[PDB]
Structures are given as C-alpha cells and as structure tokens.
Design a protein around this ligand. Structure first.
Ligand SMILES: CO[C@H]1O[C@H](CO[C@@H]2O[C@H](CO)[C@@H](O)[C@H](O)[C@H]2NC(C)=O)[C@@H](O)[C@H](O)[C@@H]1O
Ligand SMILES: O=c1ccn([C@@H]2O[C@H](COP(=O)(O)OP(=O)(O)O)[C@@H](O)[C@H]2O)c(=O)[nH]1
Ligand SMILES: [Mn+2]
Length: 273
C-alpha cells in the first residue's frame, strides 16, 4: 500500500557544483547518507520506485576516483527516488584490463541479489552535473554521459555510447549483453552501439545541458593499452554478437565484500583466449 513515486522526482535541484580537489572520507560519506543500507542499497521510504536499478562500475586500482563517485552519486540517486544498488566489479590480477567483460559479470552477479530490471553502466571517473540526468532505464537504451567536459560539453560523435549508459534487463538480454573479447582500451562501447542498432533500437539521450558531466582528469592506467584489433572487431559485431557475450561468458568470483556504500565483487576474468 505505499503509492508509486511520482513519475519525475520533485526532489531534484538541477545543476550542481562538482569538484575533485578535496579529500573524501567514506566513513563521513556514510554518515552523510544514513538511509543507504549495507552494500550500498536504497529504496525510498515513502513511495515505490518502478526503477529497480543496479549500478555497475568496472574497476581496478581507482580507489580515489571511486570515493569521489560515491560522494557525488549517492545523494543524486536518492533524490531520483530509485530503488538502487551499487556494484564495483573489481578485476583480480594484473593482466590486461577488460571493461565490457566486467560489465557482463556485474549484470549477471547483481541479478543474484535482487530482481533488478534496469542496469546503469558507469565508468568510475564520471560525475553528472545535473540531477535531472536520470540514472535509470527508458523504452530505448539510454546514453547518459552525453556532454562531458573532456569532449567540450558535447558528444565526440553522434554514435558515441561510452561513459555512462543504461539498458533495461530486456534491452541487455536482446543484444546478448556485451562483448567479452575487447581487451585493453577502446571500441567495446562502439561494439555495444552496433549491437543495439542491429537489434532494432536507437539511443535515447537527455539534452546537452542536463547531460553535462565531469570526468576526473587522470593519467594512463598501465595494463589497458589501446587494443590494436578494435577497428576490425567493431566492423564485425553483427556476426560476432550472436555467439560472443552473455551466452559465452565465464568467470570466477574470488571475493564479495559488502561495504556500507557499495558491494565490491572481485573477479577473475582470465586473459585472452
Ligand atoms: C568509432 O570511432 C569513432 O571514434 C574514434 C575515437 O575512438 C573512440 O573514442 C571514444 C572516446 O574516447 C572511445 O569511447 C571509443 O572506444 C573509441 N572507439 C574506438 C574504436 O577507438 C575516432 O577516431 C573515429 O574517427 C570515430 O569518430
Ligand atoms: O586500470 C583501469 C582501467 C580502467 N578502469 C575503469 O574503466 C573505465 C574506462 O577507462 P579510462 O578511464 O581509461 O577511459 P579514458 O578516460 O582514458 O578515456 C574507467 O573509468 C574505470 O571505471 C579501471 O578501473 N582501471
Ligand atoms: Mn577516464
């Protein structure tokens, strides 16, 4: 007998000041966010949200970015009235990084906690400047980080689908999830765009002003060099997506930690096969 939340949250304040030059204390973030429950889980107390959102962060060795992410996003996600949880998918070992494979692990593991029907995939170093930019799913796949400071506050190209995005459970299943074989930097997000288009979908976006986003400046991570096979890979997505993705995924979870503000899943996703 709780009523549905309003369709758009009345709590939103719009544009927000965001800065990355001060230290962050997660103990204090946790105290500032008392309604956030163990594992980084929150649903509103006064109404039922139709947005059951698992937020998935691909991760290795970005603890500092992550504290900023948690400081800024948690208050935003509560104002958006989402029934949500945060998952940091931490790649075990020190071999070449695989962003999209971690994202698939996150989808599949989050489903074991709770009946999530919406998946937001967010890089760790991207912070939204306007809480009108909704971190939940739409009737088409949603590209969220549309106007990043590092690309001059617009799309670097109209088919860009990197950074932060949201797919419903059904959208994600319809494309057989994300590719597993993009090792090292680049192109897995273009492949994901291809997948959506080949399954009859198009990209929904907020406007450039609501969609403004900050990227935390940082230097190159080691073990995530540009993948030189990326350009060939993206040219063949239509054929490869049929049998690469959810239906070809394995991994071994090494450790699950419930911290107050996030669940961290440490996972062995292997090396190129
Ligand atoms: C698909 O190609 C277009 O973008 C590339 C630049 O490379 C992309 O840049 C974005 C933003 O950093 C990354 O998210 C993508 O993974 C990159 N994609 C690839 C394949 O590297 C540009 O050089 C091309 O001319 C196209 O605009
Ligand atoms: O060693 C790494 C490589 C990347 N990532 C994650 O993958 C995302 C994409 O990589 P990157 O930051 O290099 O993109 P860039 O900002 O350089 O274009 C990051 O935001 C992180 O979530 C990470 O955690 N550790
Ligand atoms: Mn980055």
């Amino acid at each position: 007998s709780l009523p549905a939340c309003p369709e758009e949250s009345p709590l939103l304040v719009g544009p927000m000041l965001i800065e990355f030059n001060m230290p962050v204390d997660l103990e204090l973030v946790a105290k500032q966010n008392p309604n956030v429950k163990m594992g980084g889980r929150y649903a509103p107390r006064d109404c039922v949200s139709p947005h059951k959102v698992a937020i998935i962060i691909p991760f290795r060795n970005r603890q500092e970015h992550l504290k900023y992410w948690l400081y800024y996003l948690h208050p935003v996600l509560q104002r958006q009235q989402l029934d949500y949880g945060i998952y940091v998918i931490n790649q075990a070992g020190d071999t070449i990084f695989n962003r999209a494979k971690l994202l698939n692990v996150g989808f599949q593991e989050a489903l074991k906690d709770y009946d999530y029907t919406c998946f937001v995939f967010s890089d760790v170093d991207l912070i939204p400047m306007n809480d009108h930019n909704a971190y939940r799913c739409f009737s088409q796949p949603r590209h969220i980080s549309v106007a990043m400071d590092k690309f001059g506050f617009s799309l670097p190209y109209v088919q860009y689908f990197g950074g932060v995005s949201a797919l419903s459970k059904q959208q994600f299943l319809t494309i057989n999830g994300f590719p597993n074989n993009y090792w090292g930097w680049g192109g897995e997000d273009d492949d994901i765009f291809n997948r959506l288009v080949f399954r009859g979908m198009s990209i929904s976006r907020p406007n450039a002003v609501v969609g403004t986003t900050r990227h935390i400046r940082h230097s190159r991570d080691k073990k995530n060099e540009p993948n030189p096979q990326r350009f060939d890979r993206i040219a063949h997505t239509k054929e490869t997506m049929l049998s690469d993705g959810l239906n070809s995924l394995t991994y071994q979870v090494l450790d699950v930690q419930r911290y107050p503000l996030y669940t961290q899943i440490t996972v062995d996703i292997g090396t190129p096969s």
